[PDB]
Amino acid sequence: DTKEQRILRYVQQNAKPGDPQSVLEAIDTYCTQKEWAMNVGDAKGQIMDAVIREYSPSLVLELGAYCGYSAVRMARLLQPGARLLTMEINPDCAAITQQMLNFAGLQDKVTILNGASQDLIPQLKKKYDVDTLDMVFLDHWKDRYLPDTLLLEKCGLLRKGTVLLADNVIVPGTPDFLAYVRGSSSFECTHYSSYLEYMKVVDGLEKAIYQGP
Numbered sequence: 001d002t003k004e005q006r007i008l009r010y011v012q013q014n015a016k017p018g019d020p021q022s023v024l025e026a027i028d029t030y031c032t033q034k035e036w037a038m039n040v041g042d043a044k045g046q047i048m049d050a051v052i053r054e055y056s057p058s059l060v061l062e063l064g065a066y067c068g069y070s071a072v073r074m075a076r077l078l079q080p081g082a083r084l085l086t087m088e089i090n091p092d093c094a095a096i097t098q099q100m101l102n103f104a105g106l107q108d109k110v111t112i113l114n115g116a117s118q119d120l121i122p123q124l125k126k127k128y129d130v131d132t133l134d135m136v137f138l139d140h141w142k143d144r145y146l147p148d149t150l151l152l153e154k155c156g157l158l159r160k161g162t163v164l165l166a167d168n169v170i171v172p173g174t175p176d177f178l179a180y181v182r183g184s185s186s187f188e189c190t191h192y193s194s195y196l197e198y199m200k201v202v203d204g205l206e207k208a209i210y211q212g213p
């Protein structure tokens with residue numbers, strides 16, 4: 001078995017079915033006490049919660065699902081009828097994420113998309129019937145942040161006020177993406193300093209609000 005499978009089994013044996021908060025707490029306990037993993041975590045997760053509550057997005061896109069931690073965290077705060085789409089390139093992670101969402105009782109709010117973000121984004125309008133996105137959580141791989149942001153704009157998926165929220169802009173760091181959004185009149189940017197999940201290491205989130213072409 002894999003670390004990801006151990007995390008899922010730990011949730012299934014130590015959380016309450018249908019209780020998202022208990023799922024998050026179980027994941028955080030396992031990753032603090034047993035094995036580190038790249039979930040956004042509780043310190044940065046609290047900032048994400050604040051953002052979700054401020055904007056009450058109807059349609060969120062997540063880039064990078066992993067075990068489903070961040071998907072659980074966002075989906076538990078969505079209003080009735082609101083939806084999350086999450087893209088995940090690794091099929092074993094996609095299956096763990098689906099099972100995690102099912103355990104948490106959130107499966108009707110989330111759709112997992114299999115594949116690479118750069119291949120799936122251009123399909124959102126026609127295949128997946130998306131008009132524009134209200135929020136995007138970028139948390140896949142540092143070198144894809146800038147290219148996928150530019151792709152989302154090209155594809156007409158951003159509207160005035162779409163919120164981009166990017167993890168790990170300090171560790172490992174995303175200097176091309178930060179330089180671009182902070183220098184572009186098409187974004188209004190705020191930095192939220194925090195900590196790397198489960199570690200006493202500084203990290204941060206960037207919020208970049210799209211302002212149109």
Ligand SMILES: O=c1[nH]cnc2c(O)c(F)c(-c3ccc(F)cc3)c(-c3ccc(F)cc3)c12
Nearest residue numbers: 038039040064139140141142167168171172196
């Ligand atoms: O790749 C990631 N995607 C999403 N979120 C991540 C995340 O939240 C992380 F904290 C890390 C991280 C940071 C520091 C570290 F030491 C190990 C891993 C990674 C990551 C970075 C570099 C890699 F070589 C492998 C994984 C990711």
Ligand SMILES: Nc1ncnc2c1ncn2[C@@H]1O[C@H](CSCC[C@H](N)C(=O)O)[C@@H](O)[C@H]1O
Nearest residue numbers: 039040064066069070088089116117139140
């Ligand atoms: N181009 C790409 N498209 C889609 N998923 C990708 C990708 N490159 C990397 N990934 C995926 O991005 C994930 C990064 S970790 C995601 C953590 C998650 N957001 C959480 O906080 O719980 C991995 O599962 C990895 O397989």
Ligand SMILES: [Cl-]
Nearest residue numbers: 041042043198
């Ligand atoms: Cl944490």
Ligand SMILES: [Mg+2]
Nearest residue numbers: 040139167168
């Ligand atoms: Mg991350």
